[PDB]
Amino acid sequence: MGLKWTDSREIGEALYDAYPDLDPKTVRFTDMHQWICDLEDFDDDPQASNEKILEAILLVWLDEAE
Numbered sequence: 060m061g062l063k064w065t066d067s068r069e070i071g072e073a074l075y076d077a078y079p080d081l082d083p084k085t086v087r088f089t090d091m092h093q094w095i096c097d098l099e100d101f102d103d104d105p106q107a108s109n110e111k112i113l114e115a116i117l118l119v120w121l122d123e124a125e
């Protein structure tokens with residue numbers, strides 16, 4: 060039981076927490092999925108990263124970062 064796809068907010072905060080130096084506008088779904096799948100705390104499904112799944116996480120990263 061780690062970071063879950065539906066739990067995009069906790070993930071968004073995780074991303075901004077670990078990567079406050081990175082701008083979520085320049086971060087694409089691909090790039091984000093690399094780091095989010097690289098997360099040691101991440102534990103759900105590495106393949107079911109639906110676009111809107113990654114998008115929700117990207118959008119919340121935008122929300123937190125700015």
